[PDB]
């Protein structure tokens, strides 16, 4: 589109990031993943986008090709957070006292 970045998009930056990550993973380097991850964290992710940007696999790709803490951490958060965004359809269990207002 027109030159300059100011308005709507995200989906673009998201993809641009993935590519960067995906590339890094491919080249097995991952140097500036944090920066990428960071943005992601500060990028309104969505299920539909999770498929388009396919960043979900990008992050993991790093979290796997990276044993760091910060680069791995943020990556985890991206997974967790996305875990809620996408939260694929699966069965699970877990409950801790189900009773609001008890007293």
Swiss-Prot record:
Transmembrane segments: none annotated. Residues 12-89 form the TFIIS N-terminal domain. One of its GO terms (cellular component) is nucleus. Its main location: nucleus. It comes from the Eukaryota. GO terms for biological process: transcription elongation by RNA polymerase II. Liver, kidney and heart. Keywords: DNA-binding, Metal-binding, Nucleus, Phosphoprotein, Transcription, Transcription regulation, Zinc, Zinc-finger. It is found in: Nucleus. GO terms for molecular function: DNA binding; zinc ion binding. Belongs to the TFS-II family. Necessary for efficient RNA polymerase II transcription elongation past template-encoded arresting sites. The arresting sites in DNA have the property of trapping a certain fraction of elongating RNA polymerases that pass through, resulting in locked ternary complexes. Cleavage of the nascent transcript by S-II allows the resumption of elongation from the new 3'-terminus. This is Transcription elongation factor A protein 3. It comes from Mus musculus.
């Amino acid at each position: 589109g027109s030159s300059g970045s100011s308005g709507m998009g995200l989906e673009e930056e998201l993809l641009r990031i993935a590519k960067k990550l995906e590339k890094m993973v491919s080249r097995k380097k991952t140097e500036g993943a944090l920066d990428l991850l960071k943005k992601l964290n500060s990028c309104q992710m969505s299920i539909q986008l999770l498929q388009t940007t396919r960043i979900g696999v990008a992050v993991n790709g790093v979290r796997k090709h990276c044993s760091d803490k910060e680069v791995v951490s943020l990556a985890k958060v991206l997974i967790k957070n996305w875990k809620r965004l996408l939260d694929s359809p699966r069965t699970t269990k877990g409950e801790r006292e189900s009773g609001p207002s008890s007293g």
